Design a protein around this ligand. Sequence first.
Ligand SMILES: [Ca+2]
Ligand SMILES: [Ca+2]
Lengths: 139, 97, 650, 64, 68, 107
Amino acid sequence: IAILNGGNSTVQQKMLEYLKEKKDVGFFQSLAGLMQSCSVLDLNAFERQNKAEGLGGSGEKVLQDDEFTCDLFRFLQLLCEGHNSDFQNYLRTQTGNNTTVNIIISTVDYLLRVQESISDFYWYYSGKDVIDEQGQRNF
Amino acid sequence: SLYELLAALIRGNRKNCAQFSGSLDWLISRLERLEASSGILEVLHCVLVESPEALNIIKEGHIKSIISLLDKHGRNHKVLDVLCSLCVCHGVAVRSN
Amino acid sequence: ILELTEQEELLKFHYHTLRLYSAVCALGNHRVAHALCSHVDEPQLLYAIENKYMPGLLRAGYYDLLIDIHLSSYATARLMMNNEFIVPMTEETKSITLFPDGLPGIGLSTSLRPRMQFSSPSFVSINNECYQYSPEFPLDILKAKTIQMLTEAVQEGSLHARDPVGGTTEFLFVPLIKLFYTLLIMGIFHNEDLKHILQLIEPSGLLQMKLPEPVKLQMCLLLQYLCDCQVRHRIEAIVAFSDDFVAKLQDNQRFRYNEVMQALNCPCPEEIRDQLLDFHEDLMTHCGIELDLTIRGRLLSLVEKVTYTLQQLISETMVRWAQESVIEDPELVRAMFVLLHRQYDGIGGLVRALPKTYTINGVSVEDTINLLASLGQIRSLLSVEEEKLMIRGLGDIMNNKVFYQHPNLMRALGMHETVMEVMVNVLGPKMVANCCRFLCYFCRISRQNQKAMFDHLSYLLENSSVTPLDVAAASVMDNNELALALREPDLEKVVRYLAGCGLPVEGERYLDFLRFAVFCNGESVEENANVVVRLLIRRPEGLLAAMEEAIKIGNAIMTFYAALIDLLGRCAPEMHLIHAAKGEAIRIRSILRSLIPLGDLVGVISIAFQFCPDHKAAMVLFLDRVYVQDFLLHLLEVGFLPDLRAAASL
Amino acid sequence: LLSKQRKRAVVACFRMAPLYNLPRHRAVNLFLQGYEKSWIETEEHYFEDKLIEDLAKPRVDPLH
Amino acid sequence: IAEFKEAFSLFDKDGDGTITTKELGTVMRSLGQNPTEAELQDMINEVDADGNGTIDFPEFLTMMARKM
Amino acid sequence: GVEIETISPGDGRTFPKKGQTCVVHYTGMLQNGKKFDSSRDRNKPFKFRIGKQEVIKGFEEGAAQMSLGQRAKLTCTPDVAYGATGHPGVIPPNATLIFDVELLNLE
Ligand SMILES: [Ca+2]
Ligand SMILES: [Ca+2]
C-alpha cells in the first residue's frame, strides 16, 4: 500500500504488464486463497472470553487479527485507483492465463460473510442494551 | 549411457530417491560388475544427497562392499565423497555409520 | 607433501580423504575424534599451518580439520547458548563499571558460558572412561601462531602478492579468518590480544583493503560476534543497575506504601487496591507511570546512557562493498544487510534478548551448569540406541534442584519446543514414554507454563498410539481459562478416534481426556459440554444388559463404559437454577437420559457386595447430576451393607 | 460492625502485605519484564528515510 | 491471639491445616465480594511462597502480624 | 615374561615400585613401524599408578621391569595387548606394538 498510497498510476501500469508477460495465474489464486476466510467476527468466541474475564493479556478475538484484512482491501482499492478501466476489467475476467479467478465475485462473498457476522452480533446484543468497551471495541 | 539417463531422473524429485528403497542393495549387488561402476556410482551418489530416508536403509554389508570397491579400483575420489555424503544428510549425521 | 603441487591426482585424492576425516568427525563424535588424532597428530597440523608452500586445497582442508577435531564440539556448544544471556547476581556482576565515558573488548563478561572440558587422547584402558568431550592440544601456543600468522599475512598481503600460500588470496585469508573466527568464540583472546587484533583490523587497514568474495563473508560473521559481545555487555550493564534500583524500590515504595496503611485505620477504599494487586501487574503499575517519584531521575539518565565507535564504520563498510563491487552469492548479501539493519536498529536486537534472560543467586549457579550442559546435550543430540544419552539427560533435568524454582526459565530457554521437536523427529520407540513423562511433569509445575504447552494440541492429538495423549489432557487439567480457550474442531478428531473403536479397549484414554476437557475445576463448563454430546447423537457409541455380561466373562469393557457414563456425568448442565431456571440446558437433560432408561442396579448392587470402586462410583455422579424421596430410600443398604460388614476385613 | 470491619483487613492482607517482599530474584526479573513493555518502545526511528537515501548512492545500486 | 485462631477456623472446615480456594470463596461470597478465579487464585496464593498451593497457618499468623 | 630390549640403562636398581605413579614419556608404532602415538608429540608426560590397571597389562608388565632413567623398547605381544578386536578404530586385529618407553619420576 505504501507504493500506491497516492493512488499512483505508473506503478499501476507496471503491475499489469508484469502480469501480462509473465502471466501468473497463481497470484490471483493466492489472492482468493488469502481472501478465503481471512476474518470473521464470530460471536461464539466473543461469549467465552466475557465468561472467562467474568470469572478469571487478551483482545485476540476480533475476527482473528482483522488488521491484516484492512490492509488487504486497502491494497485492492489502491490497485484500482484512478479508474484503470483495463485493470478494473482485468481483476474481473483475467484473460491472460488459461484459467481465471474472478476476485470481484469473491469480494462480494467477503462482506456477505461479514454482514452475517455483524448482524447476529447485534441479534445477540439486542436485549442487553448497555454498552461496555468489549462491545464497543469489537464493534 | 543407460546409467547416465537414470542418474538424471533422481536429481530432481525428493520422491524418486524416496522411491528407491529396494533398488539400493540391488544396485550395490550390480556394483560388483566392476566394468561400468562409475555410471552406477553417480547414480548412488545422487540418491544419497536427496533422501535422508535412504540413508537409514543402507547397512554394513553394503558398506564393506563399497570399501572393497576402493580396493578393486584403487584411488577414485568419486568413491570418496560418497562416504562423505554417507556421513551427513541434508542437515544431520548418523552416529552409527 | 610439498611435492604434491603438481601430482594433481594424488593431490585431489588426498584432498578428498581430508574431506572424509573432516566428514566423519562432525557434530561431536568424541570417541571418533579420539580415534582420528592417531592418524593426524595435531603437531603435524601445526607444521601444516606454517608451511607457506602447501597447496590451497590442502590448506583449506587442514585448517578445517583442526577445527572439527578439537574446536567445533565446543564451538557449536557456545553457539547454541548465544541467545540466553543469563547471569548471577553476585557482587562482581553487581560492580561492573557498565559503561565508557567504547570498547567491544569487554574485560569482565560475567555471563554463564558453559565449561571447557577436554580429555587426553591416550591409548590406555580408560576406553569408556575419558570418552566424552574432546581431544586437546596446547591451544595457547596456537593463539600465538595465529597472531603471528595474521599480522604477517596482513602486512605481506597488503602489497597484493602474486604468491600467497594457496596461490589465490582466497586460500590465503579464508582458512585463517575462519580459524580465528572459531577461536574467538571459545573464550580465548583476552583483551590484550583483542586490542592487538583490532589494531590489525580497525585501527580506531585490513577491512579497508580490496577483498575477494567469500573472505568478507567470513569477516561478516566476524563482525557479528563483536556486535554480539556488544549486546551481552549491555545486558550485563543493565543487570547491575537493576540491583540497587530494586534495592531502592523495594524499600522505598512497599514500606512507605504500607506506612499509609498503618496510619489509615485497614479499609481498602482506593489507595490500597491500586498497588496491592497481581505481582507482575504491581510492577507494571509501579514502572508504568515513570514515562509520563524521587527515583525516576535514575531511569531517564540511564535510557540516555543505554542509548549506546564501531557503529560508524560497520554502517559504512556494507555501503562500500555493495557499491563498487556488485555481488553474486545470495548467502553474502543476506548476511550483509542483517548487520546493517542491526546497526541502525540496535534496540531491536535488545528487544529480542530481554524475554530470554534471567538473574539468579550464587547458590543456584551449581545446579544450572549441568542443567545447561544437559540442555546443551539435547541440542547437540538433536542431529541424528542413539537416545541412551537423552533419557539420562532428561532424568537429570527432572532431578534438578533449581528447576522447580524458576519454571519461567525452561519457558525462557524454549526447551519444551526442543523436546517436542524430538517427538516430531521420532514419530514419522521406548524413548517416547521417557519424553512425555517429562512433559506431563513439565506442564504441572506452574500456570503460564501450562499456557505455553497449550499451543500445540492441534498437532499433539494426531499421534495417539496407546503417552502423547497424556500430555494434551495434562495441559488442560485445572486452568479454566485454558479450558475455555480450547475450541471445537480438534474434538472432531477426538471422537473420530472413538468411532474407530467399533471393532474395543483403547477408547479408555480419549474419554479421560474429554473428562479433563469439560469439568476442569470442580464444576463443569457447558460450552464444551453441548458440542460433544451433539456429536454423540450423530454416532451411537443392551448397555446395562451387557454390563452384567462383563461381570462373568480382559477386564476392560466394564472399565470402558465406566468412563462413558463419567463423561456424561461431568457434562450435566448444572445442579442449580443454572440448570433449572434456564433455556435449552434442560433440553440436554432429556436427550441424555433418553438414551439411558435407568436399569442401573446392575451398577449399583451387583458389584458392590464382593473392580468395585471404579464403575459404580462413576455411576454415582450420573444419577446425582442428571437425576422423589422414595428413591432416597429405595437404593439404600445396596453398597452400605458390605461397607458395614467388610469394614474390618483387612 | 466490629467483627466484619477487622475481616475486611484480613480480606486484603493477602494482596497487600506480600508485595514483592521476599524474592530479590523475581523482583529484579519482573523489573526487566516490566522494563520491556515500558521503556523499550521508543522513537529513534526516523533513520529509515535517511537509510534508504543512504542506499541510492551509486552499475547496480545497493538498494537495487 | 486466639481470635486469630478463630479467624483461621472461620475458613477451615475440613480440618487439615490448609485453606483451599473453596473456603475463601465461600466466606467471600458470604461477605459480599464477587472475586474472579484470577483474583481468588491470587489471594489464595498471595500467601504461597513455598509452592504448596494453599494457605498454611504460620504464614497466615505472620501475615496478620505484618498487616496490623 | 613380555619381551623387552633395553635401549639405554638408567640406574638399574630403582625399578618402578608398586604404589607409585610413573611419570613417563613414550611413543608408539606398529609392527611395520607405522607411527600412531607419541606422548612427546603432545608435549605431555603420561602418568599411571602400578596396580591401578588403567594402562594395558602388557605395558604395565613391561614398565615394572625397567628402572629410573632407563629408556627401553617395548615389543609387546598383541594378545597381551588390545587383541583380536584391537583398538576399534586405531589398532588393527592382533598386531605387535613397538613402544619406546622412558621413565622420569615416581610417586
Ligand atoms: Ca482447605
Ligand atoms: Ca500447607
